[PDB]
From TrEMBL, chains C, D:
Protein name: 3-keto-alpha-glucoside-1,2-lyase/3-keto-2-hydroxy-glucal hydratase domain-containing protein
Gene Ontology molecular function: any one: hydrolase activity
3-keto-alpha-glucoside-1,2-lyase/3-keto-2-hydroxy-glucal hydratase domain boundaries: 40-234
Statement: the UniProt record of this protein carries the keyword ATP-binding: no
Native source organism of the sequence: Parabacteroides distasonis (strain ATCC 8503 / DSM 20701 / CIP 104284 / JCM 5825 / NCTC 11152)
Length: 240, 240, 236, 236
């Protein structure tokens, strides 16, 4: 039978390592979307949940003129990229995307879009379901920098779920990186980028570039190839 | 009108940054479980999907004697902790848990369990839905080391979803840490640990301890307080 | 010329900006280490403590003599007038030949990085103490990789490379500070993560701060005071 | 006796193990830096190259004289017999006073960490070149934080702290290597991540390896050969 409270090295007690502040904020999490992932938690900014693109704007200025219908929105390649009105630093993000069942094209010209983190660093979106391409630029790559850990594609018609955790960089006075950005990317529950260091801007041509910036929007890419446009749904973001 | 392929610094072409190996493995992802998260992808080890605990054993040796029923398994506190037969290093993990609707108790004595990563580092499981406790030991904490970024609890009866990404430590010859373990923890889609460094063993009493180890099992905690036992479902793990 | 994958040439990976600044390095001090490079702030090179102040306000009243300065325990801690974030630092210190005392009460001083995080200074030449608080420790957090002490009378050389933390809006750490410490050419802290304030009692504390001075510790035990020389700092 | 949160006492955060090993540090070399501490492997201190071998197999046939050794470009690279993982390293090098050449063809050598990752050696005293390949660069990957050259005839001092990578089963990096480089007391690489092999042509390559030697480069341009002294390494 026990007769006294146990103590540790030099008499330390369990209470001495029990703290009551800072209190983590209470968040009511979202629910599961059929064929998708989590909907927005109570402290998240809802960027899209089926109604409109009022949280977005054209990169050319003015309203975001992608097509909203049936609880999704669809890229209009004649209108170009759209971006969040709001700018971000560290964040967690959710976004779901669908390659249409009538998709055509090969390699980089088949359902190409992308999520530009702070407007600088592309997380590639592409139909890589039975579509080979260069591996450092396939789905879930940090475009042309970091090869994804897997190909976790769902087929056209189904929804590919991204969960993204992003840490923004800091810059020195002279414009060079003080700390690089880092990103974790999970696609359909599969980790594709595991705390990957971002080397600089994602570039189609040449080495990544070091360009000082502060907070930036999320930019969704209108890739001007002729492939049928992809659709998006259930986009939310919460600042970390 | 275009008349030549664009080039970058010193004539670099887009092809010179396009690589076709190493090819990421093709994984068929799982589906969404109603009220939960993702089921196991094709390359994952299924630790539980409703049938039995054949992937587990008692920490005392022999069969894992927690109670399997209705597609879940329920802690039997008289039997003690259970652990995976298999040992792991770096991994991604999924696990869902339910506080029963008739739960009773306060603070650390209310639906207390936990996931010991490699058998050494507890990710706390606890009913913190309207139940205050010490914040460095509440739900999703790295127990008594790292306070979770939020309280993202679902109420009793509903399923709390964990997605965990873990990097194992390396040890020096003298037994000290060469690299510390790191962990990301997401609960119901909300990030609770963002690439958190683990300082050593999780301890109820005293400072974290530095104890050299290699690969270790996942241990699920039977916390011997009188509260009604929690239930688990949809457990899978994939090695990174 | 030879070419690589898809015809890439050696010129395509040769960049001419940004140009690293030209620094004239210092020289070697006999019995010590490097003197200040041309872009460094000279905190002490034998003349005076004009770069320092008392933590109580006013002049730094430690005793300058013979090209060194010596702790005056009756006056308390001194600190740099200037505040710093990321930096590289050099500092040399001498335990006097007539030193007395044991454990933490034998030539105890310290370098508080941004005023918050102590790199321990102590005479650990044939003087055991608690290992997480011995010379070159991040005090009571990180045990040094070695004991690289020179004996009393000789000069112990610190080279320190420090990365400042960032803080979240709620006051918690966004990124922790990191520090490398080299004593007499031997690495004692290898890119060590600092957990919070260094504390004699209790767990490290998380206290939001910006730029901070370098504070040199006057530890009020009765041991004979240590002396300092060749202190410089350059911002990173 | 003062106490902290929930009555915690100062003794409860005072640990007496693990005890850091006692190391007798080296001394200061005139015009250079620290000589080898007692636990360091002495790779060169003036006598011979018995710790080295030709990369082609057999004896290292660079020329030992006057307490230094000098590159013989007809013989090619030399490397340590011993292989290393994590380490701290010291190495001093001299551009001869009669040096000639421009850009990469002027006193070019280098230290290949584990045989894979070049820390550039070059005479960049009034000699411009591409900045990502100048002195103290991680060759063509990471531009050094400064140009801290001493002139020809004088000794440039490197202190290097290196963490080896780990590799996944499929041959990709699990953890990248990191390196700190200090030249003549000035930090040139501050815990820099190495991206892969250093390459004259193309992107850095990911090639699985274990422990590797230190390789010193014989760069086959016609410039007068550089000399080395005071090389030591200690495992971390
Ligand atoms: Mg794209
Ligand atoms: Mg528990
Ligand atoms: Mg002290
Ligand atoms: Mg070279």
């Amino acid at each position: 039978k026990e007769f006294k409270m146990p103590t540790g090295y030099a008499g330390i007690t369990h209470e001495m390592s029990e703290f009551y502040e800072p209190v983590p904020p209470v968040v009511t999490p979202g629910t599961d979307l059929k064929g998708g992932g989590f909907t927005a938690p109570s402290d998240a900014i809802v960027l899209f949940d089926g109604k409109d693109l009022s949280a977005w704007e054209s990169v050319k200025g003015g309203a975001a003129e992608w097509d909203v219908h049936d609880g999704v929105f669809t890229v209009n390649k004649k209108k170009g990229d759209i971006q969040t009105k709001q700018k971000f630093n560290d964040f967690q993000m959710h976004i779901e995307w669908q390659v249409p069942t009538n998709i055509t094209g090969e390699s980089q010209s088949r359902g190409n879009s992308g999520i530009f983190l702070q407007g600088m660093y592309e997380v590639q979106v592409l139909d890589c379901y039975n579509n080979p391409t260069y591996v450092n630029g396939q789905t879930g790559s940090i475009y042309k920098q970091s090869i994804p850990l897997a190909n976790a594609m769902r087929k056209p018609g189904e929804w590919n779920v991204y969960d993204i955790i992003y840490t923004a960089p800091t810059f020195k006075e002279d414009g060079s990186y003080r700390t690089h950005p880092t990103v974790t990317v999970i696609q359909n529950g599969v980790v594709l980028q595991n705390h990957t260091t971002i080397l600089g801007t994602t570039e189609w041509i040449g080495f990544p570039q070091v360009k000082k910036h502060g907070a930036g929007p999320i930019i969704l890419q209108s890739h001007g190839d002729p492939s049928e446009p992809i659709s998006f749904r259930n986009i939310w973001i919460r600042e970390l």
